[model samples]
Target: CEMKRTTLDSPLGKLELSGCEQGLHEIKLLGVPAPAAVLGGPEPLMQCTAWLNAYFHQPEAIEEFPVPALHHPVFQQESFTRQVLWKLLKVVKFGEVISYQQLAALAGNPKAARAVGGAMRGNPVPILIPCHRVVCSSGAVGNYSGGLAVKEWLLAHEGHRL
Candidate 1:
């Protein structure tokens, strides 16, 4: 499948979503400088278009994306990590923001705020996984893979203010 690209003009900025039929594979923040920007992939851009639409309207419904089952020995307890993230995801509800430090502590690694941010910024699936919903400890919206504008848009779209 050719990678399909969908550009969404949210409160944040112009956002790009990439994916395939199996499920959404990746996302791009056109005006944002995300960590994932360091890595690029070539494929179809239209596969995950439905995903983008669904996420903008409803996120909890986005549970079917085929995010690659990545395994790393260094992350042997990765399931715990994801589980913790999932818990935090559930806690965040919608239109709310939580600091990276809070997420790290929720994940049982209070000191792993940076690592949690790394995992979030490095998420293969962005909106579908709700990584943009995370923020900084001081309640200031933090950085985003797609850029702060898009992040701000998403947060605002969810009804969160600054």
Candidate 2:
């Protein structure tokens, strides 16, 4: 049961997802347009890859969550960061976007907008958790660990015009 990893080609970049057999832990947006290739891995990794493919090409077509359980150290904590991530995942549906201020309120702190950004930066698994949907109150999509370009690509891919 060692950690496994694999790469999947996307129109935006080369995405790398890393995790153990239980579930995915992280998905890094390489931000480079690489040749088309479908890499394989453990069951959970392949499941995440399938989810990612569906997400990029046909998100609204997904009838259910495609990946396995998300296993990560950050998810194991009891803190505001974890709370924000969970809140975003549970509330924001596909093709939807929310302001950081809006999500802070949903997380039980309307004043903690910056803290929402704090949590977004700490997010290990990105798109599966849908951190890209959280934007600035000014209607501008903000910082993304996966790079702002990729962020816009995902947003547009989700049918939310940036």
Candidate 3:
């Protein structure tokens, strides 16, 4: 499916938003490659932009916006990936941290903490999936695909100490 991209300002920096007819697909930070096309005024993109604006101002506003179902080449298979992402969407509360082991248990595989980490690294949508809410069992903030700084900013924005 052909995708469209838009740029939106954020507390950290500008975010590149992309999506198709089905829903918003991916949000990439600056320095990432730009999407091939720019189509302004798509409904999903507009909605997503509004959602993000609200998110930066009121962290709890994220719960008011239904995250668009994302589609990406990397998300082609692996049911566990989908399970982990969707479960995080529901279970990872704002301003709260859950261990990877806890998230693994939520995904119905208590022994798959590492697998949960991998899924988090592969999350197509970051804040929307609430990947930053997942931390190490030792209480350390783990790796975030969007970079540790971005993750730290997101956590701090939600009142979570990094």
Candidate 4:
């Protein structure tokens, strides 16, 4: 959608933030290829950076900063996968983990645990959406779109055991 991009500094390393008039769109890690920074991006992009700073300092602080809900075609709330992300934004508290099965049920579909995993994989916003808080039913930290290393780091940062 040709979003405006910005480079944001964080404890996790440099991140690329992209968004449009609607809201923030994507957040990519350092090694990933991201859009170049554009002038005068949406206000949510700035808030996103501030939110990231707060999260790095106190993972729980993210609750205080509302960096505008992402409104993208892929993340539209009408779809079950998108609905899963929305519900996670509310119930998945910091320092807590939920199984994929549990998340699916919370999203209003008890039988969609595998689908919930798929949603997490397609999550455009990671820490902001708190997808790292989802784990395997076996109690193992499941995979993350950002990679297992990043997933483990995020979980451990929030006081979850690897």
lDDT on C-alpha atoms for all candidate structures: 0.59, 0.80, 0.78, 0.80
- Clashes per candidate, residues 3 or more apart or on different chains: 14, 0, 0, 0
Instruction: Write down the TM-score of every candidate.
Output: 0.59, 0.86, 0.86, 0.86
| Candidate 3 residue pairs in clash (backbone atoms < 3 Å) | none
TM-score of 4: 0.86
RMSD of 1: 7.3
Model 1 residue 154 CA deviation in Å: 1.0
**1-162 per-residue lDDT for model 4 (tens digits):** 557888865656778888877788888888532223543557778777777877887556678887665866777647887789889987888888899999988988899998999999888888988999998889887788888888898888887666
Q: How many backbone clashes are present in model 4?
A: 0
Which candidate tops lDDT? 2
Q: Write the per-residue lDDT of candidate 2 for residues 40-96, one digit (tens) a residue.
A: 666778788777777766666664646567778888768999999989988887788
**Model 4: colliding residue pairs:** none
What would you estimate as the lDDT of candidate 2? 0.80
State the lDDT at 24 in candidate 4. 87
Candidate 1 C-alpha lDDT tens digits along 91-132: 775566788888888888788888888778556556656788
Q: In candidate 1, how many Å is residue 89 off?
A: 4.2
**Candidate 4: Cα lDDT at 42:** 78
Task: List pairs with backbone clashes in candidate 2.
Answer: none
**Cα miss at 8, model 3 (Å)?**
0.8
